[PDB]
Amino acid sequence: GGADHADAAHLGTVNNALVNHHYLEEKEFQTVAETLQRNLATTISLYLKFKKYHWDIRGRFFRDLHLAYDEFIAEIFPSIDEQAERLVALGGSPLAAPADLARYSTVQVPQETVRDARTQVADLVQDLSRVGKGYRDDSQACDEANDPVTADMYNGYAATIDKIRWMLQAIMDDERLD
Template structure:
């Protein structure tokens, strides 16, 4: 727990920023980015769990892929948090706040066969893709072209990784 006595900015608040985006518009974009941030961290932890626990004939390839996927998600979360802070917001942090804010539910703590794990990842990834597409439109419609661009780039990378999950799940791959 922090011993700091002075709060510099309360969570959930938006301040004016040097980026000169209207505060009411910034609030909507920050809300969307915080949702994306929470979803990205939820997905990061699930992918990292599968990276740690993968077994089987395709262990090495999947271990490497899932590790790189987790790194991509971590980088996306960092970029989302930095962007929403630049817009005058406070990035959602703390495990309870992230879990409450996330639009996706993580798989439980148990370890499953890799096919089941990847199917869970494919489902979560698809849900996040749909949400991010909506948020690209929100940012674009509110005139925040930079945030829309950032989200488009992250969306492209996420779609590529989720598509790779789909390839790993093809009938000729992994024991059924």
């Protein structure tokens, strides 16, 4: 993918004379950086979305979901600083302003108050299906671009996302969940 938005190696600015793409060729950096910026915005958006649903859930599954969402945040949270800094280490600049989260994330954070357990869980399962396949695909893309290092990070993140996807899909595989 195209990564000009995340590339900091060609800026006209102070304290930037040494920035480069280390062992990656320019086109390889473009491929890898598009995945890192997208996955960073996605991870931050999942933190915000798990919190919004943690705060808004009501009804008899409140303890099940309120506590689960915090456990899932704890699993994914460290990857925010790690993905941002992998991008910086390769000569990028990570984006984290609200407008940039909205543009590059594959996950949308709700603006409405969603009380219903099934509505929350089905939304999250759809997101996590996309994000876990995303990391598997992005791992292969990075390996192909001669970046097995970023690929290895993604292999670990995909295992975590796939695990959370299973747990949430299991909870909603029940006709008595309204």
